Amino acid sequence: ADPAECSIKVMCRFRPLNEAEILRGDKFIPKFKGEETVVIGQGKPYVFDRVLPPNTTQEQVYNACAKQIVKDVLEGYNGTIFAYGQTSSGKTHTMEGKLHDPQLMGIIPRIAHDIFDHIYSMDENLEFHIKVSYFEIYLDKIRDLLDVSKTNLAVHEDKNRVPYVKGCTERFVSSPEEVMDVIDEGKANRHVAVTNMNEHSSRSHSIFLINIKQENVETEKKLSGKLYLVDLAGSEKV
Amino acid sequence: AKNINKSLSALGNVISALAEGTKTHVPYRDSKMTRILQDSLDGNCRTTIVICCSPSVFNEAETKSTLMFGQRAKTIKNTVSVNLELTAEEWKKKYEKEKE
Numbered sequence: 001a002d003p004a005e006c007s008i009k010v011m012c013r014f015r016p017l018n019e020a021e022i023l024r025g026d027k028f029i030p031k032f033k034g035e036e037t038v039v040i041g042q043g044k045p046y047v048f049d050r051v052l053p054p055n056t057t058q059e060q061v062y063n064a065c066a067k068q069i070v071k072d073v074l075e076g077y078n079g080t081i082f083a084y085g086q087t088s089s090g091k092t093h094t095m096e097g098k099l100h101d102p103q104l105m106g107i108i109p110r111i112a113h114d115i116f117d118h119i120y121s122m123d124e125n126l127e128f129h130i131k132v133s134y135f136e137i138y139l140d141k142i143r144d145l146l147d148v149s150k151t152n153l154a155v156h157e158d159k160n161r162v163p164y165v166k167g168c169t170e171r172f173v174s175s176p177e178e179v180m181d182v183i184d185e186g187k188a189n190r191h192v193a194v195t196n197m198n199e200h201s202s203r204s205h206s207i208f209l210i211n212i213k214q215e216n217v218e219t220e221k222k223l224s225g226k227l228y229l230v231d232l233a234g235s236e237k238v
Numbered sequence: 239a240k241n242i243n244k245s246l247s248a249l250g251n252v253i254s255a256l257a258e259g260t261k262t263h264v265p266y267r268d269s270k271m272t273r274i275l276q277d278s279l280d281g282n283c284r285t286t287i288v289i290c291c292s293p294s295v296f297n298e299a300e301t302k303s304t305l306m307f308g309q310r311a312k313t314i315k316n317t318v319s320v321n322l323e324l325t326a327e328e329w330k331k332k333y334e335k336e337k338e
């Protein structure tokens with residue numbers, strides 16, 4: 001069958017001014033036009049797949065940026081969502097938010113719930129196997145957040161010649177709560193041997209990987225899709 | 239000057255090269271992070287980037303660098319297919335059917 005072409009989607013989220021910006025009286029610079037454009041002063045317009053103003057709720061972010069990825073992964077595509085932007089621009093708010101709060105939780109916890117809501121309604125002939133892994137990269141070294149004794153995991157290539165982290169803990173999960181248990185576990189473990197979490201989290205990448213495998217027991221076909229959910233280190237210059 | 243994170247200059251170099259159309263010596267190997275993202279940026283993957291920005295005038299130069307990263311990234315295309323696996327017996331049946 002022939003493959004399809006698809007562009008990398010780009011959504012831009014402007015968070016509200018922060019406590020220091022408001023107390024310093026900072027002006028709000030962006031100007032919005034329609035659902036996709038933003039202009040900074042007299043500069044040329046920037047057009048994205050979506051521009052999300054400060055008044056966007058976490059659930060509106062999720063619908064605009066991640067809801068489709070979950071459907072795509074459940075059809076057997078590989079899918080990746082990464083957040084990018086300078087330290088304090090809102091990356092962790094976006095990918096995690098307040099993890100267990102229904103209104104403030106971010107993208108990762110909402111995907112943890114939505115993957116199960118879709119699976120419960122799928123075809124009765126399918127058998128599912130979902131394994132998650134949680135790791136970080138700091139000074140070009142990979143530490144397993146589910147086993148912090150492993151602080152230099154290597155990258156190898158899988159059977160489709162695709163790079164993957166070798167030797168990383170993998171946990172099979174069968175509910176949104178089991179996914180959130182892994183995240184809670186890795187969040188706590190990450191403080192181990194870190195002497196400043198504010199600085200560390202700003203200079204490190206956090207990667208949550210959800211590997212979704214499906215088998216049609218009648219047709220004998222299998223689909224699989226790896227969904228990478230990445231919270232990059234800050235992109236600011238020295 | 240340079241990005242605080244060398245994996246972030248590596249990532250800006252990878253997006254720039256891909257946005258240019260160069261894809262020869264695109265520097266994925268400059269960092270583990272860009273190695274892990276190689277398939278999301280030039281492989282068999284449907285990728286979405288959420289660029290996060292402060293709306294303060296104080297952050298304007300960093301904001302513009304983030305918007306430029308997004309504008310370049312959005313032009314990148316990938317060729318994608320679902321990851322389907324067939325047993326050898328079903329695969330041979332489709333082949334024979336496709337061959338007749």
Ligand SMILES: Nc1ncnc2c1ncn2[C@@H]1O[C@H](COP(=O)(O)OP(=O)(O)O)[C@@H](O)[C@H]1O
Nearest residue numbers: 015016018086087088089090091092093094290
């Ligand atoms: N969309 C938002 N709504 C409310 N507060 C936000 C939002 N985005 C960011 N913040 C605030 O900014 C602070 C830093 O945001 P964060 O997500 O941690 O930035 P980054 O991960 O990019 O360093 C968060 O503690 C919070 O106070």
